[PDB]
Design an enzyme around this catalytic site. Sequence first.
Site, PDB file in Angstrom:
ATOM      1  N   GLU A 244       0.824  -1.203   0.000  1.00 52.54           N
ATOM      2  CA  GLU A 244       0.000   0.000   0.000  1.00 52.54           C
ATOM      3  C   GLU A 244       0.862   1.257   0.000  1.00 52.54           C
ATOM      4  O   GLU A 244       1.003   1.913   1.041  1.00 52.54           O
ATOM      5  CB  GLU A 244      -0.943   0.002   1.205  1.00 52.54           C
ATOM      6  CG  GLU A 244      -1.695  -1.306   1.401  1.00 52.54           C
ATOM      7  CD  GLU A 244      -2.942  -1.144   2.246  1.00 52.54           C
ATOM      8  OE1 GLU A 244      -3.027  -0.152   3.000  1.00 52.54           O
ATOM      9  OE2 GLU A 244      -3.839  -2.008   2.153  1.00 52.54           O
ATOM     10  N   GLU A 494      -4.429  -8.919  -1.410  1.00 50.57           N
ATOM     11  CA  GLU A 494      -5.113  -8.707  -0.141  1.00 50.57           C
ATOM     12  C   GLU A 494      -6.607  -8.556  -0.369  1.00 50.57           C
ATOM     13  O   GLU A 494      -7.037  -7.707  -1.156  1.00 50.57           O
ATOM     14  CB  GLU A 494      -4.571  -7.472   0.591  1.00 50.57           C
ATOM     15  CG  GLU A 494      -3.266  -7.711   1.327  1.00 50.57           C
ATOM     16  CD  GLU A 494      -2.902  -6.570   2.256  1.00 50.57           C
ATOM     17  OE1 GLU A 494      -3.795  -5.761   2.589  1.00 50.57           O
ATOM     18  OE2 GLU A 494      -1.725  -6.486   2.661  1.00 50.57           O
TER      19      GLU A 494
END
Length: 670
Positions: A244, A494
Amino acid sequence: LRLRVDGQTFRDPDNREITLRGINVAGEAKYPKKPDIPSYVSDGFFDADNVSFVGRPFSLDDAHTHFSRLRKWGYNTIRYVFTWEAIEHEGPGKYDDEWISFTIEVLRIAKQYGFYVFLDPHQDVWSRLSGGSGAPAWTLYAAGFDPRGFKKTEAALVQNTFDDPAEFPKMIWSTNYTRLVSQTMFTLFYGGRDFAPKAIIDGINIQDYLQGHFIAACRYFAQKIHEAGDIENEVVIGWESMNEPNRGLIGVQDISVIPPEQQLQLGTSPTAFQGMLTGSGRACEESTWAFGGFGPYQTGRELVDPEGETAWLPADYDDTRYGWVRDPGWKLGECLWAQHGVWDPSSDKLLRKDYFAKNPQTGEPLNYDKFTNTYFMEHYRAYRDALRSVWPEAIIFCQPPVMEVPPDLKGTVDDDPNMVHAVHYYDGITLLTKHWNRLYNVDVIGVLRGKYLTPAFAVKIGETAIRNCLRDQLKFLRDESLRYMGTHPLIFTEIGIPFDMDDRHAYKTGDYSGQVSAMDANHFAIEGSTANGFTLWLYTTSNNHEWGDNWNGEDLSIYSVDDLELPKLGFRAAEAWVRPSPIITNGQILQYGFDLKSCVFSMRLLGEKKAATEIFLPDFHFPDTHTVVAVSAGEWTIDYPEIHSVKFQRLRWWHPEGDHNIKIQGVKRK
């Protein structure tokens, strides 16, 4: 070698396509082992100095026992979680070879089970001293702002510090991305020559120092894999970029207000200026925001009073700890942005409202796409070439910022035929509300990219329409991936659901119906997204009902020490994520899926000339006595292959070349 990239597909040595049904291992690598400091213990937090991730996830004896679970559940891939803090904790250039040696020992135990492993340099809001995990502590002292005072300066709301760790706000750790420390670190990490052009360490910018060590710490850990000789291409297929990536303040058109693209608030909601005053000991009144049906929610303001203590290192505290050069431009005791003319500490008023607005060198206006196509790709190209300076055949899992447009690499010099597009997706409603709404859901992707006007044309009603909404969101991301980056594979690295729904209702009753409908809907989206695989977010070996994942009050692990396994305590919705899935396919997979309600697996493919199609069949859903198999062409057999005493039922379907499909029906359950 185990796996090769061949366009949109992963292929085995005999030209069969591989489907990567994997899982993240493990959420325990986020915090140290000795001393075991999860998110809720407060003693010894700040003297990071020496840590010992030697052990996290688990001790090596339990490795072959713990790996056995993931084969029984039909997983063939693992996203290995490790932090930059695990490599360079003592200081810049001081690598933990004991952690390296112990981690190389972990991989072969996993390699005995025939896993696919790609390494994940995980991070959450930069560092664990900043309310998450990832970067080591000395990176914060390199920018210099000691975490002692972070408490009520409210730069990174730390959990290992709140009065009562059991009362840490749910899903407030993710708010730190929009706070002073994380907005500053990522801004300096991806482009210090640009917004703070006085940060000079070792004669080079803070951008080159923070990146150069992360690029090197991974490269040195990767050079061991070249010398290991037994894990390259035999279990370790490549690496991921960085978990991220955040822009911080790079592109904030106005730092005095909350930007419309920032859709997460909660806790205290400082602006960049409100975050600037608070990080200097002043005082601010901040609106506080929250959660659906709980928390602040259009709140009533709250006054924050750090009271004279800053979130900066004092002008004289000892730095001389680990090598050290600073040019006299870089200071201590004063705000970084203040000395660069962003705001005046003497008058407590901004410069204006556009320091973080246009291009450093040419003056082009910034947006999120401009950040993704430049400074992120600038950091990505070096990380790509550094891992390929050691292992040129390394598969690079490219992870752009979450839920933002991926970089336009199709047809450029970065169109890497050995790259993988890693995409994150979370059901933003259920994740933040901790309740699976069976009545409506929003096309988050459609809204973010401007498919519809506002979240009113987009929302869909009906659990069937909700399921189709999620699948079309993931399917759209695959089409966006193939449009901007080219003909490359995609891995949903994810995706998951919070297990602590409805105030621990499942922990009180054993009724996991909400988590079952959430997991089956999320997997239904993956199975129809035409993607190349996924890794469910997070397998924790120490997950419990009290602390969840033992990290930021989250409870996302599919495994728990307090829940029952599949043959008032429930099964942790295990019947929802133990699904039949293709392992290796003789040809191109056209469509597959698992209907949990009717317990029916179906897969349609385009066969190639000879080479089998190997499919996982759970023992729970598909007992050998009651499993009914039907094929449109060819023959099929069912066996129980053994991989180090580990047993799982597998079906092999030999079909001729052309259009064929299969339907496998098991036992229906209530």
